[PDB]
Design a protein around this nucleic acid. Structure first.
Lengths: 143, 199, 117, 63
RNA sequence: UAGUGGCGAGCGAACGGGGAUUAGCCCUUAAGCUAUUUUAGCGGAACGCUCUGGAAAGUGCGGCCAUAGUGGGUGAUAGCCCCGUACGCGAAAGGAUCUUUGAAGUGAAAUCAAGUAGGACGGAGCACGAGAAACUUUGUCUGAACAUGGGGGGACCAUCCUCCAAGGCUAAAUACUACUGACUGACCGAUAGUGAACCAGUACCGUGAGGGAAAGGCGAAAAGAACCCCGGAGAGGGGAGUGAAAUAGACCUGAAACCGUAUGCGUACAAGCAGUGGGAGCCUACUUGUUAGGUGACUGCGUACCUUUUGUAUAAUGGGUCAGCGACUUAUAUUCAGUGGCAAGCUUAACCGUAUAGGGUAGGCGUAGCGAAAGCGAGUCUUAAUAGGGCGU
């Protein structure tokens, strides 16, 4: 019955309207207070502004450098090697099972759980702890 | 389980039919369908579109009247709505999986309340309205939602004039019309396709 | 959906101007004055529920005091006379017996004198 | 995406999974005064203080 | 996001993916070609008695239509009373769109490139504010190799890759609405909606450019009041007649402030936010007095409301009263809580679609961190460190 059904208790609330009455609690000011900046139309303090003291993001030194080459990096957990099909973990075999990304060339495999099935890694270079798992659990690491 | 009026118990999967009735879900699904894009075309205009109104009428100080700057202002006469509404869309987005769990939950209490009549086959012969009125007299039904997958031009040209009888496809069935239209009339083909859609 | 507020404004105005009838001149007929005289006449009716209890207690006492001097006491020695004994009678029903039932009051007063207080 | 970050605070604050890194200040251009105990204790890369978190995470558009 | 930026406020790409659409050719100048719809129409199905009423579409009681049942309007609520609603026919004659077609342009249809590339000061455009500044531009001044050459790959140089500059032509996806026509509305309903429902860009205000209002409703139908009496031979009334109704009479309803006329009770020796607590008497009703209503002699306590402020009765602000309107909204991003779906996985944006379904997993967030970076990984960075310590499990 459309005459019947209604949602759960607490799932909907009712958008308190500031500026109506005195019994409602929000009347005559709306929770702003009295005179000043944060009491007027567009009383936005700029973000990061302190009042005139020198802010944090203009006292501390620049120290970064962004290389270029982590735009081509990704890595695969050992547990996700049981998510391809065909048991040949190539470079393109990780793309069509959308496990990694497009436009990613160099891939590693690190230790994050048991593999589950014997697969042949090729084109990708695992860590030291990962290759100790794949060579024991039936897999073969070639190129 | 499901009692065909002809014979023999089609006995469907109990994953779809006979589920638990979450009605917080169903209320959200019928609200999002029913506000699905309405026609919404409200059009009030502001302070900046009204005709004229661009000079101070009576000089700041020295006149005796209160400070005014525009003839076309929300305090004045036909000056302008202060928060005018330009047209905009109304559309929730529920999910793919969330739309199906609401459809699978109204299709359980439809069975527990005996509002569901499964028949062998429903086929009219000539596009004539008084032929279909007699065929619904056999099942004993009036005000019916007819759910079938073989919507034919014999069946569609009829019941475009019947007062309370509506015919739909199995993918045109929406979560309003299964809760409206007090008794629903499905066939043994349409109970199959709910396992291809909902599982 | 434009709502026009001309019909539910009127019901709340007539509800004020009903409580404010019987008043002088412009306090009973125009609304920006008759709203002040309804709030003010509600504060007085709140204070005077307490002051009602003080204006009768001061009236009961001054009637016992007059009636008990005519027999031969004061008020203050009478109350010590009754509470030497245990008679346990309010001021409200002594000041009834002072006016109407005058012979029963004298039979009370003699017992406070016998209580010798 | 209608939320532009500030470019300065994205160059003084790298973000790791244990807060916000930042380099220490005061170490440039007059250094022949200071005692090493003070030089080697400004060489690292600290993490940010709790009073400063919700100030910077509005400058960086995280809120 | 990389960059750029008094490295401040800020401004902001590309490469690569996903879609919509699906043609390429060459010389204005060596030696050129550049068969349907539309403006007019027509047919268009199915109802009878009975009540109340001024008047039946309504109460009753039955039947019929249907590829047309939520339309309009008829003396009140109509699928069947009236106009219309689903399909076909078209059209003397024009119009346009695809074609043959006619010329010519629409144009299918040959090369190539000298004051040209580059250079030097001065400026622009490139996301790019002389910056290690590539590249395109052109105001001044200059200047090549002949496709065994050439110019590009973000100062520069060698090696590799990839394209032919100094001559032209091109449909489709795309942007817009002064003008039409259908349709539709969780749009307005005469202080709203166009400034404008009314003879509105009018009246009026200006030397001008320019500004710019107020103004809807009798009844189903004018049946819009023959005739009489007072009046200036009038205005306005009193009858009489029409009508379901003239306190519907030239106009539906008809409120508040404001002004009156009657009836009751109180006020001419009494001092103030004009009320409240007690309270005599009188009046009119009801069983006749607490059955109730209206006045209030007398008397105790009592210096309005809002805003600003350490405080206002304040001689501080504001308000002549009434009736209408008059102030925390929307969109796109993101964070925290409440309640829901699936769950080491959750979810799609454009766009397709018999179109609120379905497809679409590109992309995003997560399942692993530390480091400025290369890099290494349940650890990693600093370090001569394997010692300590930071961050992480």
């Amino acid at each position: 019955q459309l005459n019947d059904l209604r949602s759960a208790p607490g799932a909907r609330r009712e958008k308190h309207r500031p500026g109506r009455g005195i019994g409602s609690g929000l009347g005559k000011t709306g929770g702003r207070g009295h005179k000043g900046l944060t009491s007027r139309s567009g009383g936005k303090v700029a973000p990061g502004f302190e009042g005139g003291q020198q802010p944090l993001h203009r006292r501390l030194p620049k120290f970064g450098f962004v290389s270029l080459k982590a735009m081509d990096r990704a890595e695969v957990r050992t547990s996700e090697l049981a998510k391809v099909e065909g048991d040949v973990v190539s470079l393109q075999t990780l793309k069509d099972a959308n496990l990694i990304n497009q436009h990613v060339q160099r891939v590693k495999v690190m230790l994050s759980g048991e593999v589950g099935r014997a697969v042949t890694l090729k084109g990708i270079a695992a860590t030291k702890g990962a290759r100790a798992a794949i060579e024991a659990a039936g897999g073969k690491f070639e190129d | 389980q499901l009692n065909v009026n002809g014979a023999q118990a089609i006995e469907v999967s109990e994953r779809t039919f006979g589920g638990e009735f979450n009605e917080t879900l169903v209320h959200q699904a019928v609200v999002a369908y029913m506000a699905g894009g309405r026609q919404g075309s409200k059009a009030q205009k502001t302070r900046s579109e009204v005709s004229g109104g661009g000079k101070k009428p009576w000089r700041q100080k020295g006149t005796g009247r209160a400070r005014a700057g525009t003839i076309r202002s929300p305090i004045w006469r036909g000056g302008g709505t202060t928060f005018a509404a330009k047209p905009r869309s109304h559309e929730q987005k529920l999910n793919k999986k969330m739309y199906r769990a609401a459809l699978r939950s109204i299709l359980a209490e439809l069975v527990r309340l005996d509002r569901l009549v499964v028949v062998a086959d429903f086929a009219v012969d000539a596009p004539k309205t008084k032929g279909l009125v007699a065929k619904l007299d056999t099942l004993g039904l009036k005000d019916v939602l007819i759910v079938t997958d073989g919507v034919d031009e014999n069946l569609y040209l009829a019941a475009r004039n019947l007062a309370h009888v509506d015919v739909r496809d199995v993918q045109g069935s929406d979560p309003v019309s299964l809760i409206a239209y007090d008794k629903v009339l499905v066939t043994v083909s349409a109970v199959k396709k709910f396992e291809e859609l909902l599982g | 959906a434009r709502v026009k507020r001309g019909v539910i404004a009127r019901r709340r105005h007539k509800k004020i101007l009903k409580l404010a009838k019987g008043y002088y001149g412009a306090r009973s007929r125009v609304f920006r004055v008759a709203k002040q005289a309804v709030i003010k006449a509600g504060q007085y009716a709140y204070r005077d529920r307490r002051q009602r209890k003080r204006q009768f207690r001061a009236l009961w006492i001054a009637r016992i005091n007059a009636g008990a001097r005519q027999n031969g006491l004061s008020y203050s020695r009478l109350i010590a006379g009754l509470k030497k004994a245990a008679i346990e009678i309010d001021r409200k029903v002594l000041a009834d017996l002072a006016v109407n039932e005058k012979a029963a009051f004298t039979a009370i007063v003699e017992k406070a004198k016998a209580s010798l207080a | 995406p209608k939320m532009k970050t500030k470019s300065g605070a994205a160059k003084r604050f790298k973000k790791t999974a244990g807060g916000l890194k930042h380099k220490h200040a005061f170490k440039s251009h007059i250094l022949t005064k200071m005692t090493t105990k003070r030089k080697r204790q400004l060489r690292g890369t600290s993490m940010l203080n709790k009073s400063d978190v919700a100030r910077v995470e509005r400058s960086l558009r995280l809120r």
